Amino acid sequence: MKFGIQFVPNEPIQKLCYYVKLAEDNGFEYCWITDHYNNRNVYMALTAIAMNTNKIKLGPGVTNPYVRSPAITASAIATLDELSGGRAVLGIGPGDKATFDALGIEWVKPVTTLKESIEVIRKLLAGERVSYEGKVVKIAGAALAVKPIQKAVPVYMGAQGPKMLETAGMIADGVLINASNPKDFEAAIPLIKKGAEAAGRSMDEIDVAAYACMSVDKNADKAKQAAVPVVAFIAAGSPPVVLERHGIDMEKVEAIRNALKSGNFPEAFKNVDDTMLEAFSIYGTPEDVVEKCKKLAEMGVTQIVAGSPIGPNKETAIKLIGKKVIPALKE
Amino acid sequence: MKFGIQFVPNEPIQKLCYYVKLAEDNGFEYCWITDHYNNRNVYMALTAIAMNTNKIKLGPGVTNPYVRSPAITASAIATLDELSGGRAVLGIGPGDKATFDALGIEWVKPVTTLKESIEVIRKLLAGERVSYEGKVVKIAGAALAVKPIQKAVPVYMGAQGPKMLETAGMIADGVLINASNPKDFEAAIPLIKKGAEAAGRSMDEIDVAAYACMSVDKNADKAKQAAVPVVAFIAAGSPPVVLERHGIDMEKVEAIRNALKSGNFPEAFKNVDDTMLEAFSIYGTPEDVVEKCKKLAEMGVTQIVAGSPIGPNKETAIKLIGKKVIPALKE
């Protein structure tokens, strides 16, 4: 099994570089840095990370077609791939409406735009002069001078709905699924397979990645507590098909949703229960986490991304995962 | 007088970092890195440059409102300012039509968009939750988490026309003028002053910067030759008011324009003459260059940006400028 790690670049980039280099030392193979306008720029963060790392794969996790021209994304990826000696991955997803309303960006046809942007980025990265007259992306003779080192930089697609999952199956080298429980991938993976089948692609060409909320501790209950704030948000933003799939107490969810609107948090955090924790996080001892990763592996997950909080102390957790989780999951 | 240096990031970023650190060692105070989708990403280049430098000011030279959301630009600048210990400048201009047709980007109202984007970036950098309902830029509750170190990161506006010059006078901390000859600034500076006056601003608040084609050599004629390719492009793209202002042989210009369309270059380069060289470059011995810089200083230029080619050998020229040009122009 492959392990990724995901960071929001919301701290001094030096601290981020320490965490990633630590992750690299601990056998993490993918480094995913989120891309939101209000934090440190994802590509500058990834530049510093590249300089402090040597082998971990690294890229935006995820960027989107809208906040920069896909052509800019292409050459940012090319640049990253040059600096890192060929370790770049492109995680790219739809973005979100609450970002694009804030930025005055029209959220046009997200499936179509993501598909067309991935195709344009790929062609640009391949060195082509691109003429692409899509429904949304319209490129007329663009060409990169900067070249990646990889022949084909991997493109990971953020995918939640069925059309996105199928599209990821047809076009993407990996699928980034914000989900921590096997039930989600039991539903998700056949959709990826339909898209793969539609393109004649084997599933072994496709890295199904769990963008999981993870919290590992030598003490299971402290792992629990660090998971609680993050599960509260995940549970609030989960679509009802995901709540229903997991039998989530729907009354607790709306009290959490309410208290989040109310800007107060301990009450929202008080209503996360053991069921939502099981559905939206991988928490507990390294033993707890290892069994849970195996259940995801058995469901077809090939990359598990340790997302926030990682653990009560991120440094302590990265070390624990490297010592006692990743070695327990070597094919 | 202040000296800047401008680089296209079209080489391995390590080489760029050497040049900038060399420039810094040689007393250059500003480092301007161009922002075009087809080269190395400007902000990743500036991240590495920051890590290899300590005191030179550095920023995009220039970015634009269109290839990334102004909000992304704001946090890229904030990020740069954090990494560099407060040395960021934002050079921002309109972009160009031949880039945005290639990218399918509508080149909407460039003066208005540049003005509104500068205002939004400033407010974002200041830490505000921004609601900005402009004619073009429409921001609704955006806010940065990343903070600059500078209280007010300097915004330099690329400006060529009279409306841009006046707008730069009203709003910008510097004006980036792609021009090498005093006649251009004799025309340009009163326009900046009109805008400054319209805002109650003194000219001593405004860094009038010559984005010059510079070529310095111990041998004047070799400096000449290295200037010839770059002047050929500048002369082809110059507006007729600039050709007319300089009495440029208009027949030579169209042969250069023709041969550039024809994709062949020695014939285009053969038709650069001593008049276009004088109008669109600062070339020659360090003595030649120093007198020419003084004539620009006397016209109101407060920053001279050594643009390509810098000299026949960029490393040799940066050293010559630091040894024999910059010290000869210390107020």
Author numbering:
A (entry chain A), B (entry chain A): 1 to 331
Provide text from the study:
Based on mutational and kinetic analysis, evidence has been provided that all three methylene‐tetrahydropterin reductases have the same fold, similar methylene‐tetrahydropterin binding positions, and the same basic catalytic mechanism; however, the binding modes of the C1 carriers and reductants significantly deviate.
Glu6 at the C‐terminal end of β1 points towards the deaza‐isoalloxazine and pterin rings. In hMfr and jMer, apparent k cat of the equivalent Glu9Gln and Glu6Gln variants decreased from 594 to 1.3 min−1 (0.2%) (Gehl et al., 2023), and from 18,200 to 71 min−1 (0.4%), respectively. X‐ray structure analysis of the jMer_E6Q and hMfr_E9Q variants were performed and the structures were compared with the wild‐type enzyme, which confirmed unchanged active site architectures compared with the wild‐type enzymes. Based on the mutational analysis at position A, it was possible to extend the proposed model of the catalytic mechanism of MTHFR (Trimmer et al., 2001) not only to Mfr (Gehl et al., 2023) but also to Mer. As the methylene group in methylene‐H4F and methylene‐H4MPT is chemically a rather unreactive aminal, it is unlikely that a hydride can be directly transferred.
